[PDB]
Assembly symmetry: C3
Homo-oligomer: 158 residues x 3
Amino acid sequence: MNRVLYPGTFDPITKGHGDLIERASRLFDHVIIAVAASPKKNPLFSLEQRVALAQEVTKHLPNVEVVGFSTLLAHFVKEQKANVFLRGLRAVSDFEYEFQLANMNRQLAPDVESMFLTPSEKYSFISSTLVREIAALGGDISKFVHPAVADALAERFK
Amino acid sequence: NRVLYPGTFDPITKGHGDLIERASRLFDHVIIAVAASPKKNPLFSLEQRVALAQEVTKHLPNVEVVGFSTLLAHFVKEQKANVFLRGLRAVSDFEYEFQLANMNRQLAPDVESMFLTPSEKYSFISSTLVREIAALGGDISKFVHPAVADALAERFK
Amino acid sequence: MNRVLYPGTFDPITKGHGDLIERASRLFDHVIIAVAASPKKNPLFSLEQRVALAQEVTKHLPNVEVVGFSTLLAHFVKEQKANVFLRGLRAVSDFEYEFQLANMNRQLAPDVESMFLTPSEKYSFISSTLVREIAALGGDISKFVHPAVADALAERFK
Ligand SMILES: CC(C)(COP(=O)(O)OP(=O)(O)OC[C@H]1O[C@@H](n2cnc3c(N)ncnc32)[C@H](O)[C@@H]1OP(=O)(O)O)[C@@H](O)C(=O)NCCC(=O)NCCS
Ligand SMILES: CC(C)(COP(=O)(O)OP(=O)(O)OC[C@H]1O[C@@H](n2cnc3c(N)ncnc32)[C@H](O)[C@@H]1OP(=O)(O)O)[C@@H](O)C(=O)NCCC(=O)NCCS
Ligand SMILES: CC(C)(COP(=O)(O)OP(=O)(O)OC[C@H]1O[C@@H](n2cnc3c(N)ncnc32)[C@H](O)[C@@H]1OP(=O)(O)O)[C@@H](O)C(=O)NCCC(=O)NCCS
Ligand SMILES: [Ca+2]
């Protein structure tokens, strides 16, 4: 009955995200990974590449699917008919941001719940941004991302 | 006591508005100092941000609005204000405000820095989130004054 | 045989940085100030200028030297044969970011320690960004930076 939507830029999706998704898949009947077009960031990967990578990482989860969107989250969730937003908390500064996003979404989409998970301690500290920067300088990122994602970063950077 | 409330106000929100109301009832003279903040790349021009702030505060006889592009520590002296007002709603706001205040204390030692918190009803409102939501056609009329809402509507088309 | 590497953008180096360097100098045999290119922050000063300013500020310390680098920190520190990273802490948001940086470097360079110092309270409130913005507006920053840095910032904005 619960359809949960996990929105993010996922540039690229990391094991941090992956941990939260494994856990959300075992908790909800239907999990939608919502990859946001985020042009105000100049994402390393195109929307289509980021959707593809997230699918690759979650294809073994039958109740998890991936979609891209460029519209307002509060609008888009209505198109997906999800009644729950999922957001991750890894740092105390995440909570502040998520707190204001949640209360703001509460005004725009009053019938959608905002819930949070924190990733396991092994998969905390993983920044999508730091993964990009490390990969860009030829550092090994295989401990932070799925092999398919690792392969994509390598190819992306020559 | 002449209080100066500096900010980008891009645009001014109900959070700012709450604090201004409260400061109006507390001080003889309240100056809203709208900073040209070129590095934030403001959605609204300085002139637009000043006009909106004026519109939102025109019912308050002891509150006036000025734009400035100069150093705050210099500008507050030109305005002859002896108090800075800044809002606090999140702890990351506090650290930044703490650091700005101790540095202004070095640049303007005779000026006091004080803080207010908006009511919980406006506590969660970010000017940034208001811009982004409006940019995507989300309704932001509950986060801002009617004149600001119109301005946001016209701003994107 | 402790060699400490202090990485940062230093755009420009401040009294905040200098305090940590003074202290690390009395604590370690060899102190390396690693100035990062950081092209993505679009630094006000070029890498060479930033190295030069750092050199000027630290020339009275016999066991301290300054180098520029554009490579992965985790690679560069091994290249320097340093066994310790030094990072400064002034606010809790720094701690969050540094905590996460330390844990990802620990994966990339497991034999390198991450240690932290906090500056004396007189220099704890000093931000290089704020120094830049104040100077760009013709404000006096001489109590926040060494004279050579003050002079360089003035020339930079005219
Ligand atoms: C939630 C949402 C609104 C904001 O996007 P976001 O949360 O900042 O992006 P993410 O969900 O991937 O999480 C933050 C990520 O962006 C990166 N990031 C953090 N701060 C950043 C900054 N100033 N600039 C660019 N990127 C940043 C980080 O790397 C972080 O990823 P990481 O934690 O894995 O390192 C977006 O997911 C969304 O759904 N947009 C739809 C638009 C909408 O409905 N409203 C606009 C305001 S709600
Ligand atoms: C102090 C000052 C630089 C910061 O701008 P500010 O608006 O007062 O501080 P902020 O309010 O931006 O801090 C966070 C808030 O702004 C938003 N915000 C902060 N940084 C932002 C950024 N880069 N981009 C977009 N939005 C931002 C957030 O939404 C948040 O909420 P709010 O806008 O509703 O108030 C500006 O007010 C000022 O007074 N400048 C004078 C310049 C000067 O004399 N010296 C420069 C160094 S002192
Ligand atoms: C990781 C790193 C960014 C940390 O160093 P650092 O934080 O920049 O060190 P500094 O004290 O000189 O600079 C800090 C300032 O940069 C600011 N800053 C951080 N990210 C920024 C960004 N994208 N854009 C602009 N300013 C930024 C911070 O707000 C901070 O401001 P403040 O100190 O005035 O308050 C980098 O400098 C480093 O030490 N090693 C990088 C190695 C690597 O991974 N790649 C190197 C290739 S260049
Ligand atoms: Ca600094």
